[PDB]
Scaffold this motif. Structure first.
Motif, PDB file in Angstrom:
ATOM      1  N   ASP A 186      56.549  58.451   3.116  1.00 38.45           N
ATOM      2  CA  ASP A 186      56.753  58.240   4.604  1.00 38.45           C
ATOM      3  C   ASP A 186      56.799  59.548   5.585  1.00 38.45           C
ATOM      4  OD1 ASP A 186      57.463  56.417   2.976  1.00 38.45           O
ATOM      5  OD2 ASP A 186      59.603  57.034   3.722  1.00 38.45           O
ATOM      6  N   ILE A 187      56.403  59.169   6.798  1.00 41.88           N
ATOM      7  CA  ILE A 187      56.376  60.348   7.729  1.00 41.88           C
ATOM      8  C   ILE A 187      57.210  60.352   8.929  1.00 41.88           C
ATOM      9  CG2 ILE A 187      54.682  60.786  10.055  1.00 41.88           C
ATOM     10  CD1 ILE A 187      52.376  59.567   8.827  1.00 41.88           C
ATOM     11  N   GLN A 188      57.976  60.910   8.824  1.00 42.56           N
ATOM     12  CA  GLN A 188      59.838  60.815   9.518  1.00 42.56           C
ATOM     13  C   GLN A 188      59.381  61.201  10.558  1.00 42.56           C
ATOM     14  OE1 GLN A 188      62.249  60.438   7.182  1.00 42.56           O
ATOM     15  NE2 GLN A 188      60.879  60.349   5.904  1.00 42.56           N
ATOM     16  N   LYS A 189      60.391  59.643  11.444  1.00 40.21           N
ATOM     17  CA  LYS A 189      60.296  59.692  13.436  1.00 40.21           C
ATOM     18  C   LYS A 189      61.292  61.087  13.715  1.00 40.21           C
ATOM     19  CE  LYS A 189      64.807  57.824  13.345  1.00 40.21           C
ATOM     20  NZ  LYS A 189      65.777  56.858  14.806  1.00 40.21           N
ATOM     21  N   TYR A 239      54.721  59.939  25.170  1.00 39.81           N
ATOM     22  CA  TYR A 239      54.771  59.208  25.945  1.00 39.81           C
ATOM     23  C   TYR A 239      56.578  58.884  26.556  1.00 39.81           C
ATOM     24  CZ  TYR A 239      51.119  56.329  24.431  1.00 39.81           C
ATOM     25  OH  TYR A 239      49.564  56.167  23.955  1.00 39.81           O
ATOM     26  N   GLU A 284      43.617  64.986   7.548  1.00 44.71           N
ATOM     27  CA  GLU A 284      42.471  64.606   7.014  1.00 44.71           C
ATOM     28  C   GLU A 284      41.940  65.783   6.439  1.00 44.71           C
ATOM     29  OE1 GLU A 284      40.381  61.502  10.562  1.00 44.71           O
ATOM     30  OE2 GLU A 284      42.361  60.676  10.684  1.00 44.71           O
ATOM     31  N   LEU A 298      53.186  62.638  20.189  1.00 47.46           N
ATOM     32  CA  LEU A 298      53.249  61.417  20.071  1.00 47.46           C
ATOM     33  C   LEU A 298      54.077  60.289  20.846  1.00 47.46           C
ATOM     34  CD1 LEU A 298      51.549  58.670  20.538  1.00 47.46           C
ATOM     35  CD2 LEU A 298      52.633  57.524  18.547  1.00 47.46           C
ATOM     36  N   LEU A 358      50.521  65.484   9.682  1.00 44.88           N
ATOM     37  CA  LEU A 358      51.005  64.197   9.809  1.00 44.88           C
ATOM     38  C   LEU A 358      52.310  63.791  10.703  1.00 44.88           C
ATOM     39  CD1 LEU A 358      49.404  61.569   6.826  1.00 44.88           C
ATOM     40  CD2 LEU A 358      48.873  61.909   8.947  1.00 44.88           C
ATOM     41  N   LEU A 400      49.280  64.489  24.011  1.00 43.26           N
ATOM     42  CA  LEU A 400      48.981  63.491  23.597  1.00 43.26           C
ATOM     43  C   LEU A 400      47.402  64.117  22.522  1.00 43.26           C
ATOM     44  CD1 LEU A 400      48.747  60.442  22.254  1.00 43.26           C
ATOM     45  CD2 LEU A 400      47.042  59.760  24.601  1.00 43.26           C
ATOM     46  N   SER A 412      51.421  65.303  14.202  1.00 39.97           N
ATOM     47  CA  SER A 412      51.255  64.373  15.038  1.00 39.97           C
ATOM     48  C   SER A 412      52.142  62.972  15.743  1.00 39.97           C
ATOM     49  CB  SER A 412      49.683  63.702  14.290  1.00 39.97           C
ATOM     50  OG  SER A 412      50.049  62.648  14.882  1.00 39.97           O
ATOM     51  N   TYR A 413      53.145  63.092  14.756  1.00 38.06           N
ATOM     52  CA  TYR A 413      53.676  61.773  14.816  1.00 38.06           C
ATOM     53  C   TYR A 413      54.970  62.275  16.516  1.00 38.06           C
ATOM     54  CZ  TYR A 413      56.316  57.302  14.396  1.00 38.06           C
ATOM     55  OH  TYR A 413      57.602  55.941  14.173  1.00 38.06           O
ATOM     56  N   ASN A 424      51.760  66.073   5.062  1.00 37.39           N
ATOM     57  CA  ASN A 424      52.441  64.746   4.555  1.00 37.39           C
ATOM     58  C   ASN A 424      53.543  65.662   6.613  1.00 37.39           C
ATOM     59  OD1 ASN A 424      54.872  62.693   5.105  1.00 37.39           O
ATOM     60  ND2 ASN A 424      55.765  64.301   5.505  1.00 37.39           N
ATOM     61  N   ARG A 478      46.740  64.990  13.931  1.00 35.06           N
ATOM     62  CA  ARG A 478      45.913  64.141  12.525  1.00 35.06           C
ATOM     63  C   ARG A 478      44.803  64.611  11.378  1.00 35.06           C
ATOM     64  NH1 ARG A 478      46.891  58.203  11.203  1.00 35.06           N
ATOM     65  NH2 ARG A 478      44.172  57.621  11.050  1.00 35.06           N
ATOM     66  N   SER A 493      48.539  65.405  19.341  1.00 40.32           N
ATOM     67  CA  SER A 493      48.764  64.381  18.212  1.00 40.32           C
ATOM     68  C   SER A 493      48.056  63.847  17.519  1.00 40.32           C
ATOM     69  CB  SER A 493      49.594  63.071  19.053  1.00 40.32           C
ATOM     70  OG  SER A 493      49.554  62.354  18.361  1.00 40.32           O
ATOM     71  N   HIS A 494      46.103  63.902  18.398  1.00 43.27           N
ATOM     72  CA  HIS A 494      45.468  63.853  17.438  1.00 43.27           C
ATOM     73  C   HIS A 494      45.055  64.660  16.580  1.00 43.27           C
ATOM     74  CE1 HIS A 494      44.793  59.917  20.960  1.00 43.27           C
ATOM     75  NE2 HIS A 494      45.527  60.056  19.804  1.00 43.27           N
TER      76      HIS A 494
END
Ligand SMILES: [Zn+2]
Ligand SMILES: [Zn+2]
Ligand SMILES: [Zn+2]
Ligand SMILES: [Zn+2]
Ligand SMILES: [Zn+2]
Ligand SMILES: [Zn+2]
Ligand SMILES: [Zn+2]
Ligand SMILES: [Zn+2]
Ligand SMILES: [Zn+2]
Ligand SMILES: [Zn+2]
Ligand SMILES: [Zn+2]
Ligand SMILES: [Zn+2]
Ligand SMILES: [Zn+2]
Ligand SMILES: [Zn+2]
Ligand SMILES: [Zn+2]
Ligand SMILES: [Zn+2]
Ligand SMILES: [Zn+2]
Ligand SMILES: [Zn+2]
Ligand SMILES: [Zn+2]
Ligand SMILES: [Zn+2]
Ligand SMILES: [Zn+2]
Ligand SMILES: [Zn+2]
Ligand SMILES: [Zn+2]
Ligand SMILES: [Zn+2]
Ligand SMILES: [Zn+2]
Ligand SMILES: [Zn+2]
Ligand SMILES: [Zn+2]
Ligand SMILES: [Zn+2]
Ligand SMILES: [Zn+2]
Ligand SMILES: [Zn+2]
Ligand SMILES: [Zn+2]
Ligand SMILES: [Zn+2]
Ligand SMILES: [Zn+2]
Ligand SMILES: [Zn+2]
Lengths: 172, 172, 172, 172, 172, 172
Positions: D80-83, D35, D63, D31, D24, D52, D27-28, D21, D59, D55-56
């Motif tokens: 859940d993935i928290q914001k 942006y 995995e 991301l 991930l 970016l 990662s978010y 978790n 991930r 972020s990848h």
């Protein structure tokens, strides 16, 4: 405190500084050995090349520890590099014996570093030592013992022929 | 009875099972020999390589007999692979002598297998042994005798120089 | 005492000798399995190939431990390689189940070896086992469980069609 | 119980689920950062590209843990993935500081995972974390500290010129 | 107001933020599905690969919307990514049915986004959805329906053979 | 007396031994400098690379003198390599100033060596110093003065921007 420092004990930091010194000292010993074989009255070029290569590898060992100290946010404190215990290394066999002794001493220091790391719960440092240092030492020690064995079997150091042929066939 | 079985005596079937075991035992002997030469206090890398190659060849000899047992519709029954008669092989010369002895014993077993096949009128089996096994044994035995001869001539096993130079010039 | 020996407990030395035997035994089990699939009345060539490959890998596992014993200045003592528990492996599914069981037993022995190494403060040996053996066992065990699952799902061993199609599509 | 499960504590299983978790979530965060730099009123394309890429990578970190959970016969339970904590990251310097903080938090969680593994005598898991995660975190943390240092030295975040030139010369 | 903003309604801006979330949620669902197939007790590697590829595509769908939000001078507000409705996806057929349902839900959201865009006289946004999203959804939905059909016809999910053969021949 | 010794004064021999030490000391100084720039709180990678390259060149300078000592039939006597005068080099500008000072000190020692050689009528040694050492020192000193000048002109060391841009555009 360094902004990158995390889980890195001051005792680990100091022990890394001591290991750096020891790898630079191992470099210098081998350098000395190398140019002993280059003397006109010794004249074993492949022994010389062998030890010169070793000298350069030890420098690399030291530099990677210096990189590690900075990676972990420790601070490098360099100390004098002591001159080796001998000026004259006597024979190929004697130099190989002295290198064996040296690599076992470098290895004992590294095993003590790993013990310290595990005692401080620093798995990053413990694994760094495992991955980059411990098997290298094991291999170096095996190779040096193999060389001692052969030189002894061949009749070194009394047989000047033995050292000449080893230089040509094993080190060359 | 296997649907493929034809002209294949039960005695041939059992003797093939025994030969399989013997080839696996020859493999193990050579494996032992190989890692004897890898010891730091023996340190003859090309003897080690030579015997390791031999170990792998013997495994192949065994697998082709196992394939043959199934080809003829016999059934494979494996037995324990006995550990070799020595742990310490003493010298290059002694190991080569022991391998010579071994290959002559493997060869006697194969000649007995061929006699059995001819006694049972199994020309397929007799020719299989001829084609794939008999000349291989003859060559192995010649090569090993050549190696024994040279090592003896050179002063092995007392001359540690002799074994070193043979390792380099004949096996290397 | 070997001139290269350093920080290597006699208990570690003996446990390495036992692991060598166990890897050679795993090799033999797989060899047996392989030639079971080569029988005219079983005739699943890709199962045969799969297990034969496994047999060869296990031999490699054993040889690297033998190299390690000599690297550390321990001494190799080989023991008989026991014949496998079965002659007839019954079906593809049954052989895969038996291999799964085997790899979990090899893995338990390795985890016990690692525990011993850590108990003796031998980080070189502990890391050697970690690096070269532990994840390999985890992967082998996963792959074998995946194979068991699929064969079961497909209707093996009753469905002769299931084993045939698995041989072709997964192992081939 | 999974047929592949061996020496894998339920506490390790749950901690792996929590680490998944967290990777991930990392990662978010990246991301979001990426942006932010793509906004017309921020417009630092190489900061955007840098985050970016990060972020990848995160991930990927997640995995490989998910693969590990299945390898060991644990079961994945996703949460859940928290914001992320911010929508607006303020400046290049501030985002790099926030990423530094994040990577040190991911690293603390991993060091706790390793402690747990060693406490449960799971050397496979401990080594997995060592091999694949710990030095990666050390490098990430060093690189981020290097970036913070330079941006500060250059006069960020007040110097809009500083961030522009860093984007071009270090990140581009 | 962004200096680039032109003909972009606040309602469109918010709906884009919701679509971003939904594409990230679709990514997570597929990720979950993928690693369900990687379990040792499911073991359908090509289903796993198929869903993993899908997961990555959905991430791309989300990133292109995030790029669009910035292009139009809107502002990205990320929300938590909800964990999927299941942990265990039951079978290949069930996962394909669940993905079908998911893609039709993503498509309904996109058709509502297009309706909104046309209602706000935003032909740039309406065409963006048409060009990059609508036919992609139509194709995804067709492909998933084709997969459901075949799996059903073959006897899934009861036939473990059906799912195995589909994995090999359609997804592999 | 060495069989190769000819026209080589004992004073020249000793001065060569001192120069060897000084070149090894210059190597160590630069090594120290290099890893100062690698600190997370300095973080100027091209300064680091520049000094690391310098460190390696100085080692070469020392080795060629050691080769010369043996060529002439002199005997190498190594002395400790002193640790550098600083642990913390303060800034790019300060390190370049310190290197300038160092290279002028190495050069003064070499000019004294040449004076000695000419005083002893050793044209081989005088020319060796001329050919391999004197212009190298002149170039090093010019380059370092050029670097000092630029860094000063740019506003170093107060301008953190100045050092960053020099690192990128001159050293990178
Ligand atoms: Zn070494
Ligand atoms: Zn070293
Ligand atoms: Zn001293
Ligand atoms: Zn001693
Ligand atoms: Zn060394
Ligand atoms: Zn490790
Ligand atoms: Zn043979
Ligand atoms: Zn044979
Ligand atoms: Zn026995
Ligand atoms: Zn006899
Ligand atoms: Zn043979
Ligand atoms: Zn295996
Ligand atoms: Zn094994
Ligand atoms: Zn038995
Ligand atoms: Zn059991
Ligand atoms: Zn195995
Ligand atoms: Zn990262
Ligand atoms: Zn991560
Ligand atoms: Zn929330
Ligand atoms: Zn905090
Ligand atoms: Zn990270
Ligand atoms: Zn412990
Ligand atoms: Zn899709
Ligand atoms: Zn989508
Ligand atoms: Zn929720
Ligand atoms: Zn519905
Ligand atoms: Zn979709
Ligand atoms: Zn209309
Ligand atoms: Zn259109
Ligand atoms: Zn220089
Ligand atoms: Zn110099
Ligand atoms: Zn001093
Ligand atoms: Zn001065
Ligand atoms: Zn210089």
């Amino acid at each position: 405190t360094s902004q990158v420092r995390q889980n890195y004990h001051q005792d680990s930091e100091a022990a890394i500084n001591r290991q750096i010194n020891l790898e630079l000292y191992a470099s210098y010993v081998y350098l000395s050995m190398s140019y002993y074989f280059d003397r006109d009255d010794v004249a074993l070029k492949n022994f010389a090349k062998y030890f010169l290569h070793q000298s350069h590898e030890e420098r690399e060992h030291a530099e990677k520890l210096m990189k590690l100290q900075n990676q972990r946010g420790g601070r490098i404190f360099l100390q004098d590099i002591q001159k080796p215990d001998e000026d004259d290394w006597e024979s190929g066999l004697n130099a190989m014996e002295a290198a064996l002794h040296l690599e076992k001493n470098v290895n004992q220091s590294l095993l003590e570093l790993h013990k310290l790391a595990h005692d401080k719960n620093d798995p990053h440092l413990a694994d760094f030592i495992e991955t980059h240092y411990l098997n290298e030492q094991v291999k170096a020690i095996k190779e040096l013992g193999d060389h001692v064995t052969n030189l002894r079997k061949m009749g070194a150091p009394e047989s000047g022929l033995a050292e000449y042929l080893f230089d040509k066939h094993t080190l060359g």
